[PDB]
C-alpha cells in the first residue's frame, strides 16, 4: 500500500507517464496519447516483504528463510521489487487490418508493488 512518498526509500510504487510518441506507438494507438503506467523500484529487506501485505509476502518469506540458511538455489536468488497488483485500461487503436478497435488491455497499469 506503499505509494512512494519522498525519501522513505523502500520498494515502492513510483510514478511515470508513458508518451506513446516516445515509444513509437503514436502510430497505431489512436487514444489516449499516453498514460500513467508507473513502475516499481525500491529495495527488498527481510522485514518489508513479510510485512508488505502484498500477494508475495507469504511466499517471499518462505523462500527467504531458505535464502538466510544459505540454500544454493536461493543463495543466488535476488528478491526483486516488482508489480504485485496491476489494473486494466481501455485503448482505441488500429488492429492489423487497420480497423478502428476499442479494447480493455489488461495489466497496463502498475497498481501495487512488492518484493519477491
Amino acid at each position: 500500500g506503499l505509494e512512494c512518498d519522498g525519501k522513505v526509500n523502500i520498494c515502492c510504487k513510483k510514478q511515470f507517464f508513458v508518451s506513446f510518441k516516445d515509444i513509437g506507438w503514436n502510430d497505431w494507438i489512436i487514444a489516449p496519447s499516453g498514460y500513467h503506467a508507473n513502475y516499481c523500484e525500491g529495495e527488498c529487506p527481510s522485514h518489508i516483504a513479510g510485512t508488505s501485505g502484498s500477494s508475495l509476502s507469504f511466499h517471499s518469506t518462505v523462500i527467504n528463510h531458505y535464502r538466510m540458511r544459505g540454500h544454493s538455489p536461493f543463495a543466488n536468488l535476488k528478491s526483486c521489487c516488482v508489480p504485485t497488483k496491476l489494473r486494466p485500461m481501455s485503448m482505441l487503436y488500429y488492429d492489423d487490418g487497420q480497423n478502428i478497435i476499442k479494447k480493455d488491455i489488461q495489466n497496463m497499469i502498475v497498481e501495487e508493488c512488492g518484493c519477491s
Binding site: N26, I48, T51, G53, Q98
Partner: protein, 287 residues
C-alpha cells in the same frame, strides 16, 4: 518499538518502517494513515500475525483528527461516519461548471465536474472528449478543436485527432489495397483515410489493387486465405487459423448470409472453409 504505514480494515498495522522507536518520533511525520505499534516482538510473530491476526494487533493511528493532513490538490479531509481522517476527492468545480458531457471512457457524466471527480477518485486518464451524451453514431457529435469524429467495432463515437502527414513510400511493397478498392501507399495513408472517413475500411490484401473476378486472381500473403464477396464483387485476405474453443459463454450470431452460427469464431470457420465472406449482421441467433 515498531512504526507502520497503514491501517487495514481490521484496524491493524501493516507495512513496517522503523525499529526500536517511540510513538511521537513516528507520529512526527504528518502522514495521514501512519500508525504506531507498542510491543516488541520477534519478527516471526509479526509474520504469524499476518496469517493469524491479518496484520499487527493494537494499532494506534497517528491521526484521529484532520490537522495538517496534506491530501494534495483536489483531495480534502472529510471527517467520517466513525471519525477517521479520510482524504476525499474535491476537484475545482465552479471554475468549469454546462450540460451533460462525454468522457473518453465512453461513459456520460452529469456535468464536467462530475467527471473530474471521477478522474481523481479512480481514473487518472479521464477527460471530456465531446459535449453532451456520448452517442453511438458520428451524426450529431460536435467534436472540439481539430479533433474529428470516429467510431469502433461496437459503434461508439470518439473525438480524435487524425495524422494527415504521411511520408512518400520509397517502396512498392509498402503498398496496400483497401476493402474500398483503393490502392494506398502506406499503412499510414490507409489509416489516414480510415480516420478522415471515421469508420474502419479494412485491408483487403497487400500489394496494388488488382481487379479480380474471383479469389483466383488474389494472392494472399501471411498464411492468410482469400474470402470473396459476391454481392460487392471483391476479395479479401484473412487469417483462418482461429480454433473456436468450447464455451456456452457462446453468444451465437446471425451472419451476412442469415445462418445462426454458434459463435463469431464459428462464423469465420465457415467463411474460411467455404471461401466466402461472412461478416456479422445481428446479435443473437438467426430467426
Amino acid at each position: 518499538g515498531n512504526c507502520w504505514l497503514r491501517q487495514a480494515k481490521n484496524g491493524r498495522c501493516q507495512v513496517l518502517y522503523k525499529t526500536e522507536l517511540s510513538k511521537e518520533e513516528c507520529c512526527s511525520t504528518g502522514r495521514l494513515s501512519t500508525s504506531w505499534t507498542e510491543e516488541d516482538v520477534n519478527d516471526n510473530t509479526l509474520f504469524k500475525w499476518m496469517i493469524f491476526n491479518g496484520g499487527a494487533p493494537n494499532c494506534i493511528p497517528c491521526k484521529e483528527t484532520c490537522e495538517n493532513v496534506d491530501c494534495g490538490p483536489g483531495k480534502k479531509c472529510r471527517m467520517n461516519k466513525k471519525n477517521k481522517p479520510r482524504c476525499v476527492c474535491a476537484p475545482d468545480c465552479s471554475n468549469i461548471t454546462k450540460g451533460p458531457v462525454c468522457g473518453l471512457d465512453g461513459k456520460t457524466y452529469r456535468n464536467e465536474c462530475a467527471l473530474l471527480k471521477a478522474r481523481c477518485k479512480e481514473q487518472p486518464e479521464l477527460e471530456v472528449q465531446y459535449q453532451g451524451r456520448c452517442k453511438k453514431t458520428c451524426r450529431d457529435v460536435f467534436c472540439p478543436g481539430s479533433s474529428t469524429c470516429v467510431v469502433d467495432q461496437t459503434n461508439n463515437a470518439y473525438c480524435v485527432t487524425c495524422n494527415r502527414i504521411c511520408p512518400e513510400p520509397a517502396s512498392s511493397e509498402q503498398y496496400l489495397c483497401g476493402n474500398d478498392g483503393v490502392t494506398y501507399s502506406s499503412a499510414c495513408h490507409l489509416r489516414k483515410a480510415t480516420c478522415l472517413l471515421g469508420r474502419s475500411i479494412g485491408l483487403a490484401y497487400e500489394g496494388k489493387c488488382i481487379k479480380a473476378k474471383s479469389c483466383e486472381d488474389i494472392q494472399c500473403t501471411g498464411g492468410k486465405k482469400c474470402l470473396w464477396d459476391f454481392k460487392v464483387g471483391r476479395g479479401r485476405c484473412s487469417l483462418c487459423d482461429e480454433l473456436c474453443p468450447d464455451s456456452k459463454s457462446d453468444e451465437p450470431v446471425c451472419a451476412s448470409d442469415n445462418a445462426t452460427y454458434a459463435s463469431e469464431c464459428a462464423m469465420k470457420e465457415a467463411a474460411c472453409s467455404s471461401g466466402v465472406l461472412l461478416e456479422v449482421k445481428h446479435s443473437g441467433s438467426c430467426n
